[model samples]
Target: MNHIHEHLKLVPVDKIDLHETFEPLRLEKTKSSIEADDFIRHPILVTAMQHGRYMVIDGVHRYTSLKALGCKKVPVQEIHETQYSISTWQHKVPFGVWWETLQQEHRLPWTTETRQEAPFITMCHGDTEQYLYTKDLGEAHFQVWEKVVASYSGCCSVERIAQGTYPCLSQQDVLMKYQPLSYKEIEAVVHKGETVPAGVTRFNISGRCLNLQVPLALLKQDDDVEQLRNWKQFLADKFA
Candidate 1:
C-alpha cells in the first residue's frame, strides 16, 4: 500500500506518441503555463507500461502546457501495473452519478451523438471517446453505475474509491468532483439568462470550464501566492 516517488526517464517527444497511450484532453490554458515555468514545483502523475510507453493518468493540463512550451523532457511519477486497476487507476476517477451512468451504459453513442450533432460540446474535445474506452467503460459501463449508486447510498466508502476496490465510482469520479457547475446547473444558468455569453453557452468538459475563467493576472502571480495557488492546486489535485 506504499506509493513511491521516483524519477523516471523522459522519452523524446517524438518517440512518445501521446495518442498511443494518453489522449490529449485539453489545451494548456495560457502560453506562460505552457512553458512549464508555472508548474515547476508540482509533480506530474503518469502511468507507464513496460517498454517506456506511458499515459498521463492525471496532470493532462500540465503535460499539455509543457509540450506546448516545447519542453524536451518532462518529469513524471509512473504508476506501476501493480498499482493500476480498472477501478483505482488515476484516469478512471469518477465524478458523479452521470459519470457512472456513462461508464456503465457504454454511452459512447450518447457522447458520439452529442459530438456529431454539437461538435462544440465540451466532452467532445480531446480523445474523450478513446479515453472512456481505455478505462474499459466501453464494456463495463453498467457495472460501474451499479457501483456508483451503491457507494453514494452509503454502502461503500472513500477507501473503496482509493483502493480501486470500491463497488462504485471510478476514475471518472475524480474529474467530476472539481466541476463548479454540474451539467444541469450550467444548463439552468445558460437558459435563465436572456443573453448567454458567446463562449458560455457551449457544453465543455470539466477541464475546459476550469481554464475558461482563469485570468492572466492570476497566472502571473508568484507561486507562493496562496488563494489562486490553492485554486489551481485544488483542481490539479482533485481531478487527477
Candidate 2:
C-alpha cells in the first residue's frame, strides 16, 4: 500500500484525544507560535487519526490553533495505525518529515509549514522581563523567554486594543501581521531555486539569526511585501 494509503486519514476534534497526541518533544512556544502561524495562514490537506473516540495523529497544531481561534468545526485527515508510540512518532515524524517522506514516496512535493516567516517581539521592564504572550493565541497568556525578538517592544498597551477592534498598532496586531512565511514559500525558495527578499532572515527562539540564503525573487509576491510593511509599521509605532 502507498504511504498516504497506509498512514493518512482525518477525524474531528472531539473524536481525538489530545492527551495522547501531545508530543513531549514538540517545539518550544517560540517555534510553536511560528509553526502555528504558518498552519493558520496556509493549511495543507491531510488526514488525522481517529483512535476510537478521539484524534490520534496529524494536524495537531492545526487542531489546537483552530480551537484557539474559536473555530466551530475543524476538518482533519487521519493517520493509520503503525504500532508506533506517539512519542516515537513525534521523534520520527517531527514537523516537516512527513512532507518530505511524501515527496520521496510519491514523486510530488508535500505542503510546507511557514513558521520561519513570522518573527516574535516582546516587552520588558526593570529586572522583570515580559516575553511575548499568547494564551494559545486566545485569552490565556504565558511568558516566553526563548524566542524574544525585540524587547520592550510595545507600540500600544494591551488595554488600548479592544477585543474586536482593528488598529495601526497593537500587540496582537503586530504578531498577526507577520505570522511568518508559509512552508510552501520556504520550500520553494530552497528547492525550486527561488529567492527571498534582502535583509529578511530567519530567527529561532534560541536567539540565533541566519540569512535565509534564498533569493528575493521567490518572495516577491505583493502580499508578502505588504504584510512585511504592516509589521514594520507596528514595530515602529510601538517603540516610538
Candidate 3:
C-alpha cells in the first residue's frame, strides 16, 4: 500500500529459512544456479511472514545453495502482506530440463516426448483456481488473482532453459515449468461499492451463509473464513 515499502531487500542470509518440501536439494542444480546467478545476478524470491522471517517460497534451491556457500547476505524479492500461500509468478527453468533427464534422474519412467510446435496448455494454480494458456517457452499469461487482493497472481513466468519453442514432459513437469504466481504484478483493480463481481459467497462466524455478491479478489488478507458445513450447504445456498 505504501510506496516506501521494500519489495526487494538485501538482508542477512541468516534471516531467511529454507522451505521444507518434496523439492530436492540437487547439488548440480544448485551449483549451476549459483554460477548463473553470479553471472546473471538474479535475486532469489522469498515471502515475508508474520514473524519477521523470510521463507524461500520460490527460490528454495538458490536459498539453500547460497546457505551452503556461506553467504552472509542475499538479495531477496519479497511477496508482501499475504499468507505464506500468496500466489504470484516468476520465471525459471522447468524442473525436467533444469535437471538432466529429470524423470530418469528422479527414478520415474523416462521418455523424451518432443513437440514440433508447443500446443496451447492451461496451467492452473491450485490455490487461486486460475488458469493460463501458453504455446511457447518464454511467454507469460498474466491476470489479477481474485483470491489475493492487492497481491498479484498469474502465469507470469517462462522457462529459462530454452528461449525458443517447447518440448514434451509429464503433466507435473509442465506444471513445475510454470513459475509461482506470487511474483507477478498486483494489478490495480479494486472494488468501489455495491457494483462488484457477479456472484460470490462466504460464511459468517456462525457458519451462516450469505451472498457476498462481491469479487473474491477484493477480500482483504486475514479475512475470517467461516467453517463450512458441507458442499450441499453451498449447493442449496448458491453464492451464499
**Could you report the Cα RMSD, in angstroms, for every candidate shown?**
17.9, 24.2, 21.3
**Per-model C-alpha lDDT, please?**
0.36, 0.30, 0.36
Candidate 2, run of 10 with poorest lDDT: 86-95
On TM-score, the stronger of 2 and 3 is 3
Pick by lDDT: 1 or 3, better one: 1
What TM-score against the true fold does each predicted structure earn? 0.32, 0.24, 0.32
Backbone clash numbers for all candidates listed: 23, 33, 11
Give the per-residue Cα lDDT of candidate 3 at 1: 28
* C-alpha-based local distance difference test score of model 2: 0.30
lDDT of 1 by residue, 1-240 (tens): 112312333333433323212223445343454444444444445545346655544455566665565655555556554453322111232345654554565434333432223221122122343222213344544233234333333322322113233433233434211112233333333234322211111121121112222222333344434634554454455443
Q: How accurate locally is residue 95 in candidate 2, as Cα lDDT from 0 to 100? A: 21
Better of 1 and 2 by TM-score: 1
Q: After TM-score superposition, what is the CA distance of residue 19 in candidate 3 from its true location, in Å?
A: 3.0
Report the alpha-carbon TM-score of model 1 versus the true structure.
0.32
TM-score, structure 2 vs. true: 0.24
Q: Which regions in candidate 1 have their CA more than 4 angstroms from the true location?
A: 1-5, 17-26, 30-37, 88-240
